Amino acid sequence: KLFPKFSQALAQDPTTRRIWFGIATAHDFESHDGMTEERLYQKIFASHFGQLAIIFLWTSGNLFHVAWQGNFEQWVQDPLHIRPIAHAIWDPHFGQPAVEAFTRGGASGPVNISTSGVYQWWYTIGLRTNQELYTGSIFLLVLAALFLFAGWLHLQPAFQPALSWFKNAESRLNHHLAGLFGVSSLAWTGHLVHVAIPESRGQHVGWDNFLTVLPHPAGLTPFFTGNWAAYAENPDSASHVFNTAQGSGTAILTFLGGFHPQTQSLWLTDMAHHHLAIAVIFILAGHMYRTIFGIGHSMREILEAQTPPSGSLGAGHKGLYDTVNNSLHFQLGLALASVGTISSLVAQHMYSLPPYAFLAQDFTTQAALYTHHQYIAGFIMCGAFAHGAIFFVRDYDPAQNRGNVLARILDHKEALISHLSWASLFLGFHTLGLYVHNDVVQAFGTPEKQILIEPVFAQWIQAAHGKTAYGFDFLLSSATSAPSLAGQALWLPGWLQGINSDANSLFLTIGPGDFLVHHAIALGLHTTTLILVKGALDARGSKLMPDKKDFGYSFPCDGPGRGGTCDISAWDAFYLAVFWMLNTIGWVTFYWHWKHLGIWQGNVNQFNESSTYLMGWLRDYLWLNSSQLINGYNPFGMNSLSVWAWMFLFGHLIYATGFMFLISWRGYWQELIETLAWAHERTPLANLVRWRDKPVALSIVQARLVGLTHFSVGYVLTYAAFLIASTSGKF
Amino acid sequence: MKDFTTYLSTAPVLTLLSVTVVAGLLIEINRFFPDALIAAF
Amino acid sequence: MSAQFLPSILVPLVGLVFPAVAMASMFLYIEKEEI
Amino acid sequence: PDVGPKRGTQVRILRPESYWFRETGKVVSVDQSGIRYPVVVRFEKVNYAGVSTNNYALDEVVAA
Amino acid sequence: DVAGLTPCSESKAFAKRKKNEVKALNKRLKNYEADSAPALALKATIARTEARFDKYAKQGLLCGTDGLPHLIADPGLALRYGHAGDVFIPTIGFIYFAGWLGYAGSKYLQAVAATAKPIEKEIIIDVPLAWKLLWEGFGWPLRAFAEYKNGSLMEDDAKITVSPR
Amino acid sequence: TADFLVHHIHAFTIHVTVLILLKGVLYARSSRLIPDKANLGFRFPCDGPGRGGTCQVSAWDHVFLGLFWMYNSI
Amino acid sequence: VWAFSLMFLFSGRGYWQELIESIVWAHNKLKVAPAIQPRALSITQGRAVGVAHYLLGGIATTWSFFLARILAVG
Amino acid sequence: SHTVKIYDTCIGCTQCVRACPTDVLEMVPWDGCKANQIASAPRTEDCVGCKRCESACPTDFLSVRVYLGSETTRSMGLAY
Amino acid sequence: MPIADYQVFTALFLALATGIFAVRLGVALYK
Amino acid sequence: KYGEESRYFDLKDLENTVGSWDMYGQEDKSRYNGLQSEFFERAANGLSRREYILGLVAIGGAGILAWGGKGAADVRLPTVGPQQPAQVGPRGRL
Numbered sequence A: 001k002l003f004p005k006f007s008q009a010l011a012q013d014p015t016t017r018r019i020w021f022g023i024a025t026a027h028d029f030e031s032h033d034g035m036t037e038e039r040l041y042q043k044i045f046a047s048h049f050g051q052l053a054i055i056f057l058w059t060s061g062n063l064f065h066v067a068w069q070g071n072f073e074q075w076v077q078d079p080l081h082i083r084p085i086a087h088a089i090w091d092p093h094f095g096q097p098a099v100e101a102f103t104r105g106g107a108s109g110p111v112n113i114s115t116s117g118v119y120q121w122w123y124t125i126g127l128r129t130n131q132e133l134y135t136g137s138i139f140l141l142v143l144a145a146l147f148l149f150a151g152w153l154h155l156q157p158a159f160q161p162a163l164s165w166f167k168n169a170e171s172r173l174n175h176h177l178a179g180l181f182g183v184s185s186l187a188w189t190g191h192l193v194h195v196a197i198p199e200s201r202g203q204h205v206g207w208d209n210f211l212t213v214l215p216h217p218a219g220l221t222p223f224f225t226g227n228w229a230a231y232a233e234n235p236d237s238a239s240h241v242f243n244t245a246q247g248s249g250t251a252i253l254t255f256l257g258g259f260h261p262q263t264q265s266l267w268l269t270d271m272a273h274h275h276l277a278i279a280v281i282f283i284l285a286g287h288m289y290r291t292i293f294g295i296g297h298s299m300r301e302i303l304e305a306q307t308p309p310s311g312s313l314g315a316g317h318k319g320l321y322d323t324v325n326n327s328l329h330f331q332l333g334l335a336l337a338s339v340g341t342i343s344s345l346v347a348q349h350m351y352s353l354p355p356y357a358f359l360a361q362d363f364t365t366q367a368a369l370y371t372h373h374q375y376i377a378g379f380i381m382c383g384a385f386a387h388g389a390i391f392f393v394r395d396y397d398p399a400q401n402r403g404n405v406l407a408r409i410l411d412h413k414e415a416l417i418s419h420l421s422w423a424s425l426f427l428g429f430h431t432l433g434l435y436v437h438n439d440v441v442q443a444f445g446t447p448e449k450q451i452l453i454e455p456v457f458a459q460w461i462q463a464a465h466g467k468t469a470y471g472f473d474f475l476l477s478s479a480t481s482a483p484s485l486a487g488q489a490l491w492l493p494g495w496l497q498g499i500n501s502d503a504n505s506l507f508l509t510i511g512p513g514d515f516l517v518h519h520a521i522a523l524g525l526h527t528t529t530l531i532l533v534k535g536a537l538d539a540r541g542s543k544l545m546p547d548k549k550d551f552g553y554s555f556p557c558d559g560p561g562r563g564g565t566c567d568i569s570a571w572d573a574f575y576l577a578v579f580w581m582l583n584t585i586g587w588v589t590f591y592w593h594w595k596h597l598g599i600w601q602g603n604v605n606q607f608n609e610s611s612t613y614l615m616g617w618l619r620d621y622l623w624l625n626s627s628q629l630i631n632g633y634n635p636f637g638m639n640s641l642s643v644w645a646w647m648f649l650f651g652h653l654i655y656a657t658g659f660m661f662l663i664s665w666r667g668y669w670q671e672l673i674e675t676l677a678w679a680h681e682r683t684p685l686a687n688l689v690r691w692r693d694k695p696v697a698l699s700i701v702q703a704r705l706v707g708l709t710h711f712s713v714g715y716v717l718t719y720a721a722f723l724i725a726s727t728s729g730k731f
Numbered sequence B: 001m002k003d004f005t006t007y008l009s010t011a012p013v014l015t016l017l018s019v020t021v022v023a024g025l026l027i028e029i030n031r032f033f034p035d036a037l038i039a040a041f
Numbered sequence C: 001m002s003a004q005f006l007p008s009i010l011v012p013l014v015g016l017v018f019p020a021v022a023m024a025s026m027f028l029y030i031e032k033e034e035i
Numbered sequence D: 001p002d003v004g005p006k007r008g009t010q011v012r013i014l015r016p017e018s019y020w021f022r023e024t025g026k027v028v029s030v031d032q033s034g035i036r037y038p039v040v041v042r043f044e045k046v047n048y049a050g051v052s053t054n055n056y057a058l059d060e061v062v063a064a
Numbered sequence E: 001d002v003a004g005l006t007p008c009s010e011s012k013a014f015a016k017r018k019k020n021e022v023k024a025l026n027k028r029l030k031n032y033e034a035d036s037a038p039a040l041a042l043k044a045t046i047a048r049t050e051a052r053f054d055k056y057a058k059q060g061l062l063c064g065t066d067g068l069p070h071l072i073a074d075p076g077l078a079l080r081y082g083h084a085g086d087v088f089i090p091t092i093g094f095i096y097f098a099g100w101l102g103y104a105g106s107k108y109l110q111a112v113a114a115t116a117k118p119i120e121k122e123i124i125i126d127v128p129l130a131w132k133l134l135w136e137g138f139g140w141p142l143r144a145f146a147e148y149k150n151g152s153l154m155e156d157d158a159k160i161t162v163s164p165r
Numbered sequence F: 001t002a003d004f005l006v007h008h009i010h011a012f013t014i015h016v017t018v019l020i021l022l023k024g025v026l027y028a029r030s031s032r033l034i035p036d037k038a039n040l041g042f043r044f045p046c047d048g049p050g051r052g053g054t055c056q057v058s059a060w061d062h063v064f065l066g067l068f069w070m071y072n073s074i
Numbered sequence G: 001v002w003a004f005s006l007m008f009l010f011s012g013r014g015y016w017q018e019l020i021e022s023i024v025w026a027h028n029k030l031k032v033a034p035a036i037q038p039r040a041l042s043i044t045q046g047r048a049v050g051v052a053h054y055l056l057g058g059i060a061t062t063w064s065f066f067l068a069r070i071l072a073v074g
Numbered sequence H: 001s002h003t004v005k006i007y008d009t010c011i012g013c014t015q016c017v018r019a020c021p022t023d024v025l026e027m028v029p030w031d032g033c034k035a036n037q038i039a040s041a042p043r044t045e046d047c048v049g050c051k052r053c054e055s056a057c058p059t060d061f062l063s064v065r066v067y068l069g070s071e072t073t074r075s076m077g078l079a080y
Numbered sequence I: 001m002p003i004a005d006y007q008v009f010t011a012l013f014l015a016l017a018t019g020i021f022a023v024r025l026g027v028a029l030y031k
Numbered sequence J: 001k002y003g004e005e006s007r008y009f010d011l012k013d014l015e016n017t018v019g020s021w022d023m024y025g026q027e028d029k030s031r032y033n034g035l036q037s038e039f040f041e042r043a044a045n046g047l048s049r050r051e052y053i054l055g056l057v058a059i060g061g062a063g064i065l066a067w068g069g070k071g072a073a074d075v076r077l078p079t080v081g082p083q084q085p086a087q088v089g090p091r092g093r094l
C-alpha cells in the first residue's frame, strides 16, 4: 500500500480509492511530495520529449501499415476509383461472411478502408511507391528513438537545464519564430520545389537523383540576380493532368489562386510560394527580441509601456510579463486557446480550400477530417479555459497584479457573467422560438407562414469576395472596383472562377436555414463560454463560498449547509461546460454534414427547405441517413457496414452507461457496497479470499469524471460511426 | 369580502388571470387579423 | 502482405500475453507495501 | 464613554467575507468590552444560512 | 430584389404552392356534402388560404427559390427597398411593449420596496397600484431617458454587494 | 426464444426496481455509513461530503432512483 | 423536455447559486432587485425537477410515437 | 484525517459541538467574545467530514471550517 | 514493389531498440 | 468472551469477543492415502516457487502464440482461411 510514490497521503488510504486517485493525479507534478520549481520544469521537459517520440512513432506506424498492407501504389494510378486501405484485419472472432465482406480494395484478405486522408496527402507531397513510405517510417522511428534519448539525457545532472533557462522567454520566442517556424517553412518550400512540384509533373526526383535535377530551367541565377519573376514564367496549364507531363510547366513560385481543374485542390506552386513568404516573415519576426547581442526588445518594458493614459485600463499591463513567465498554467491556457482556434481554422479551411489532390472527391475523408478537427478544437478550448481557472486558483497573486488588466477584469466579473448570460438567453429564446414557430406552421400545412430571415450580412460579405449570386456588386463583385483591378492579373481570375462555381465548397450559398443554424452555433459558443468564464472568474471565491481558493481547484462540495453547495468548484464549471461544448460541436458537425450531403448528391433543395424546422433535421437527416448504418447486420446477413452498426450501438451503450454515474450519486452505492462486503465476509469457501483494499464507492468528483468520460466517448463513437457509415454507404 | 379580494390578488391567481387575458387577446387578434407575417401598416 | 504469419502472432501477443503480463505486474506493484 | 456608533444607526459593512458586504444595516448594540467583534448589526436581507444578524469590529463598519 | 430574391408576386414556386394547397383542400372537400359542417369548415379554410397567399403577394414580400417568403433584417437595405415592416418596424414595436412591461414591473418593485413589508407585497400584488403603474409604463421611453440623464436610473457600484474576488 | 429473452429482461428490470425501493425502505432509519439516518428525516439531500460522500443517501433519493428504473421497466 | 431534465440531473446547486449572484448584481445595478431573494432550487428540488421532466419527456415521446403509429396503420 | 479550524469570529454558541456526530469539537475558555468561550478540534482524527458543524455555525462567514484531506479508515466511516 | 519480409523484420528490430530507449526514458522519469 | 450469562465482552478473552471463529474448520491429519498423497506432493515438487509456478503460466502464453501461428490454422479458423471474390462499392470505386 504505497504505490502513489508521489503522494504520501494517498499511499495511506486503505481503500480502493488510493489506486483510483493514484492514476488521476500522476501528471499533477505541482501537487507531488517534495516538488520544486526546477524539478517540475525538468520533468515537464522530459515529458515533452516522450510525447514527441510517441507522435513520431504513431506517424511511423501509419506509414508502415499503409506501405505493408495498403494499396497506395494502386491508388496512385486510380485515385478516384480505388478506396484507400488503412491496415489489415486479423480477428479470430470473424466468421466467413465477415472475412469475405471486409475484403475490398483488391486486398488479399479483410482490411480497413482509410478515412484519415493520408493517401491524398502523401500523394500530393511527392510520395509514389511503398519503398518511400517504408523509408519514411524507418526515418521517423530513428527520430523517435533520438528524441527518447534526448529526453533521458536532459534528465541527468550534467545536462539538466536551470530554471532560469526555462524563463528565457525572449530567446525561446526568437528561436521558435525564426527557427521552429521560419526555417521549417523554408525547408518545406525546398522539398516542394525539389520533389512535390517535379513529381506532380511526371518527373521522379528522389535522394538518388535530386542533385542532378534542376528545380527550374534557370537554376539559382534569377534568385540571386533579383529576377524572381522568372520563377513564375509558365505555370501548369488549365488542362494539366496530375502525376503526368501533359499540360505541365516550369514555374515553381506562382500565385494563380483557385483550384486545380483536375485534382480540385490548390496548386502546388501556390503552396510553395506561400511557405516561402511565410518563412521569410517568420524569420524576420524571429529577429525581434533581445538576447545577448545588445539589440532586440524587452517584453517586460513593452508590457509596462502599454498603459493608456487617463487610466482607462488602470495600470495597464504592468507585471504581466512575470505573471505569464512564472505561471505555467497561464502559458498552457494561452497555448491551448491558440491551438484550439487554429484547429478550428484548419477544419474550416481544408473543406473550402482542399490542399491535397483528389481530396474534395473523397466525401468520407473530408467529413471525417472536418469533424475530427472540430471535436479536437472543442476539447482543447475547454482545456484552455479549465487551465485559466486553475491559474486563477493557484498562481494568481493580487499584490503582483494590483491595478493591471487582470485585477480590473476580476473587479467587474459580475458585469461579464451577466452580459454573457443575457446574450445566451437572447440567442436561445429567439433561436428556439423561431425553430418552434417554423415547426408549428409546417405541421399545420402552412409553410408560407415560416419566419425565414435572409442572412443579408453574410451574403454581403460573400459578395465582397466575388460571389455574384446575390446581386450586390460590391468590391470583388464589381470588375471596375479598385481591389478588382489591382489583382486583376494576379490571383483574382482563379479565385473568382472557384468562388462563383457551385461544384466546390468555396463559399457555399446560404439562406434562412444557414441563418438559424448559425445563430444556434452562436448560442452554443456563448453558453459554453459563459460556463467556462463564470467558473474561471469565480474560482477564487463567490458570495456562497468566499474562501473557495483555500479549497483548491477541485473538491466535491462544501456540504449541504447554506442551502446546498453541489458543483461549486471551478472543476465543476469545466465539467458542466464539456456537455455544452459537445452539444455545440454536434450542432456544427450536423450542419456541415447535412449541407455537404445535399451538395454531394446534387440536391441543395433538401437542406434549403428542411433545415428551417427541427422535424426536417430529425427526419430528413438523422432518420433518412441511418437506414444503411442500422442495416450493417440483420437476420438476413451482414456487409462491410456491420462494424459501424456495432460501433453505433456501442456508443449508445457507453453514453447510457455514463448517464448512471451522472444521475446516481455516492450514497446509495456506499451502502450497497457495505452490504456486498458483509455478504463476502459471511460466505463460506469465499472467506478464504480477502481483499487487500477496502472496497468503497467512487468519489463525488471521480464519479463526475467517469460519467463525463462515458458521455463523451459514447457521443464521439456514435457520431463517428453514423458519419462514416452514412457518407461511406452512399459514396 | 376583503379576504376574498386579497386571495384573488395573490401571485398564482393574478399570474393565471394575466396569462389567460393575454392569451385570449392574442387569440382574438389572430382570429380577426390572421396570418400577420409582417407589420403592414 | 509480406510475412502473413506476423499478424497471427503479434495480435495475440499484444492482446492476450502483453495485457495479462502488464495487469499482473501492475497488480503486484500497486500492493507492495514497500516499493 | 462608548466606542463605536450608537444603537439604531445605519452602517455599511466593509468585510468582503460578509454576505452583506457594502450593504447597510442597523446597529442593534455595541459591547463595551475588549471584544474583537462587539458591533451587532441587523439586516433586512437574510443570508444563505437564513441569518439576519452578525458581529463586526469597529473598523468593519462605516456610519450612514 | 435584394439578395437574388424574386418578389412573391412574380414567383412561380409561390403560385404553385398556393395551387397545391388549395388542390389538397378541395380533394379533402370532395368527400363531403355541399352544406354540411365539414364542407363549410373546409371551404372556410380554402378561403383563408387564398386570402393569405393573396395578401403575401400583395404586401410585397420577397420569395426565394423555394417559393416561401423571406425577411430582410437590415436597416437601410429594408428601408430603401420597402421592407421596413419585416424586422425594423416589428423591432420598434417589440422594444416598446417589452420596455413598457419591464418599466411597469420596475416601478412596482421600487414602489413596494419602501413598504414596511415588501415580500408580502410581492406575493400578494396590490392590484390598484399595479394597474396605475401599468398605465404609467406606456410613457416608459421618456421616463427612462429622463432617469438616465438624471442619474437616478443607476445604483452606485460602491453600494452594490460583490464577491471577495 | 425472443419471448424468453424479453421475459427475462422484464424480470431483471422488476428485480432492480424492487432492490432500489426495498433498500431505501430497509435502510431509511439507519445504516453502517450513517447510524442516525432516521434523525435526518425522510427527505434530505445528504450528510456532507465526508465518509467519501453521502449524496442521495435518504429514502427519498431511493424513490427518486426507483422512478427511473420503473420508467425503464415499463 | 426529456433533454431539459438532464440539466437538472447532472448539475449542482452551487453553480446556479453563483450564476444567480451575478444576475442579482446586474439587477441591483438598475435598482430592480426583488426583496424575495432569488435562490437556486434545493438539491432535493433539483432532483425532483429532473426526474419529473425525464419521465414526462420519455412517456410523452412514447405516447406520441405509439398513437401516431397505431392511428396511421391501425 | 481532515483539517478542522476555528477562527476568532466564533461567538461561543456551542452549536457546532452539539452537531458533531463523532465528538471532534469541544468548548474551551476564551476572552474574545461575550460568551467567554471558543471552539476547538482536539480530536480531528475522528472527524468524518460531514460538515454538520458548518451547517450550525451562525456567524458570517463561518467560524469553523473543515478542509477534507487524506482519507483514513475512520474518516471514511467504514465499519468493515 | 511491395516491401519484403526482411524489411518488416528490420523495422520490428528497430522498433524494439526504440522501445528499449523509451523504457529507459520512462525509468529515468520515474526517479 | 465468558458468555456464561449476558456478558459478550471480556478483555482477558478479547479473542472470543470479536467473533474470531473458524466456524467450519477442523484439524485432521488422517484422510488422504499415503501412497496417493506422496505421488501428488512428488509431482508438484519444485513447482511451489513463485518463479517456477509462473514458468508454468508462461507455457500458457507460448500456447497462445502457438495457436495463432499454428493452432488457428489447424482448426480452419475463418480469419486464417481464404477469401472469395469481392465487391465494387457505392459508385465507381473498389
Ligand code: CLA
Pocket: A044, A045, A048, A049, A052, A165, A166, A168, A169, A171, A172, A173, A175, A176, A178, A179, A180, A181, A184
Ligand atoms: C531553432 C532552435 C529551436 C528549435 C528548432 C526548437 C524546437 C522545439 N522546441 Mg525549443 N528552445 C530553443 C530553441 C529551439 N527549439 C531555445 C533557444 C530554448 C531556450 C530559450 C528552447 C526551449 C524549449 C523548451 C522549454 C521546450 C522547447 C520545445 C520544442 C519543441 C516544440 C514542440 C514541438 O515539437 O512541436 C512542433 C511545433 C511546430 C512544428 C511549429 C508549429 C506550427 C503550427 C502550430 C502547426 C501548423 C503548421 C502546418 C499547417 C502543419 C501541417 C502539417 C500537416 C500536413 C501534418 C520543438 C521541436 C518543447 C518540447 O517539446 O520539448 C521537447 C519545450 O518544452 N524548447
Ligand code: CLA
Pocket: A023, A024, A025, A026, A027, A028, A029, A332, A379, A380, A381, A382, A383, A384, A386, A390, A553, A554, A571, A574, A709, A713
Ligand atoms: C497540452 C495539453 C494539456 C496538458 C499538458 C495538461 C496538463 C494538466 N492538466 Mg489538463 N486539460 C487539457 C489539456 C492539458 N492538460 C484539455 C484539452 C482538457 C479538456 C478535456 C483538460 C482538462 C483538465 C482538467 C479538468 C484538469 C486538468 C488537470 C491537469 C493537470 C494534471 C493532469 C492529471 O492529473 O493527469 C491525469 C490524467 C488522466 C486522469 C487521464 C484521464 C483519463 C481520460 C480522460 C479517459 C480516456 C478514456 C479513453 C478515451 C477511452 C477510449 C474508448 C474506448 C475504450 C472505446 C496537468 C498539469 C487537472 C488539474 O489541473 O488539477 C488541478 C484537472 O482537474 N486538465
Ligand code: CLA
Pocket: A421, A422, A424, A425, A426, A427, A428, A429, A432, A523, A527, A530, A531, A576, A577, A579, A580, G003, G004, G005, G006, G007, G008, G009, G010, G011, G015, G019
Ligand atoms: C434540451 C436540454 C437543455 C436545454 C433546453 C437547456 C437550456 C439552457 N441552459 Mg442547459 N444544460 C443541459 C441541457 C439543456 N439546457 C445539460 C444536459 C447540461 C449539463 C448538465 C447543461 C448545463 C448548463 C449550464 C452549466 C448552463 C446552462 C444554461 C442554459 C440556459 C442558457 C440560456 C438560453 O439558452 O436561453 C434560452 C432558454 C431556453 C431555450 C429555455 C426554453 C424556454 C421555455 C421553453 C419557454 C417557456 C414557455 C412555456 C410557458 C413553458 C412552460 C410550460 C409549463 C408552465 C407547463 C438555457 C435555459 C446556462 C444558463 O443558465 O444561462 C444563463 C448555464 O450556465 N446549461
Ligand code: CLA
Pocket: A422, A423, A425, A426, A427, A429, E087, E090, E091, E092, E094, E095, E097, E098, E099, E101, E102, E103
Ligand atoms: C413577436 C414575438 C416575440 C416574442 C414572443 C418575444 C419574446 C421575448 N423576447 Mg423578443 N423580440 C422580438 C419578438 C419577440 N420576442 C422581435 C421582433 C425583436 C426585434 C429583433 C425582439 C428583440 C428582443 C430583444 C433585444 C430581447 C428580446 C427578449 C425577449 C424575452 C424577454 C422579453 C421581455 O420583454 O421580458 C421582460 C422585460 C424585461 C425583463 C425588462 C425589459 C427588457 C427589454 C428587452 C429592454 C428594452 C429597453 C432597452 C433599452 C432596449 C435596448 C436593448 C439593447 C440590446 C439595444 C422574451 C422571451 C430579451 C431577451 O432575449 O432576454 C435575454 C431581449 O433583450 N427580444
Ligand code: CLA
Pocket: A653, A655, A656, A657, A658, A659, A660, A661, A663, A664, A668, A672, F016, F019, F020, F065, F068, F069
Ligand atoms: C445502459 C446504461 C446502464 C447500464 C449498462 C447499467 C448497468 C447496471 N446498473 Mg444502472 N443505471 C443507469 C444506467 C445503466 N445501468 C442509469 C442512467 C441510472 C440512473 C437512474 C441507473 C441507476 C442504477 C441503480 C440505482 C442501480 C443500477 C444497477 C446496475 C447494475 C445491475 C446489475 C446487472 O445488470 O447485472 C449485469 C450487468 C450488466 C448487464 C451491464 C452490461 C454488462 C455486459 C452485459 C457484460 C459485458 C462483459 C464485458 C464486455 C467483458 C469484459 C471486456 C473487457 C475489455 C473489460 C448494472 C451493472 C443496480 C446495481 O447496483 O446492481 C444490483 C442499482 O442498484 N443502476
Ligand code: CLA
Pocket: A054, A057, A058, A059, A060, A061, A062, A064, A087, A088, A089, A090, A141, C006, C007, C008, C010, C011, C012, C013, C014, C015, I008, I011, I012, I013, I015
Ligand atoms: C502507435 C503506432 C502504431 C499503432 C497504433 C499500431 C497498431 C497496430 N499494429 Mg503496428 N507497428 C508500428 C506502430 C503502430 N502499430 C510500427 C512503428 C511498426 C514498425 C515496427 C509496427 C509494426 C507492426 C507489425 C509487424 C504488425 C503490426 C500490427 C498492428 C495491429 C495489431 C497490433 C499488434 O498486435 O501488433 C504489434 C505491434 C508492434 C509489435 C510494434 C508496435 C510498436 C508501437 C510503435 C508501440 C507504440 C506505443 C505507443 C506510442 C505508446 C502508447 C501507450 C500504450 C502502449 C498504452 C494494430 C492495428 C500487426 C498487424 O498487422 O495486424 C494485422 C502486425 O503484425 N504493427
Ligand SMILES: CC1=C(/C=C/C(C)=C/C=CC(/C)=C/C=C/C=C(C)/C=C/C=C(C)/C=C/C2=C(C)CCCC2(C)C)C(C)(C)CCC1
Pocket: A329, A330, A331, A333, A334, A337, A341, A384, A385, A387, A388, A389, A391, A392, A536
Ligand atoms: C480564462 C483565463 C485565461 C484563458 C483565456 C482564453 C481561453 C482566452 C481566449 C480567446 C479566444 C479563443 C480568442 C479568439 C480570438 C480571435 C480574435 C481576437 C480575432 C480577430 C480578428 C481580426 C483582427 C481579423 C481581421 C481580418 C483579417 C485579418 C482579414 C480578413 C478579414 C478579417 C476581419 C477576418 C488565461 C489563462 C489567458 C488568463 C486567466 C484565465
Ligand code: SF4
Pocket: A556, A557, A558, A559, A560, A564, A565, A566, A567, A665, A700, F045, F046, F047, F048, F049, F050, F053, F054, F055, F056, G043
Ligand atoms: S449532495 Fe453531495 S455534492 Fe451536494 S452538498 Fe451533499 S455531499 Fe456535497
Ligand code: SF4
Pocket: F050, H004, H019, H020, H021, H022, H023, H024, H025, H046, H047, H048, H049, H050, H051, H052, H053, H054, H066
Ligand atoms: S465535519 Fe462533521 S465530524 Fe468533522 S468536526 Fe464537523 S461535525 Fe464533527
Ligand code: SF4
Pocket: H006, H009, H010, H011, H012, H013, H014, H015, H016, H017, H038, H039, H053, H056, H057, H058, H059, H063, H064
Ligand atoms: S457553531 Fe460557530 S459560533 Fe458556534 S461555537 Fe461553533 S465555531 Fe463558534
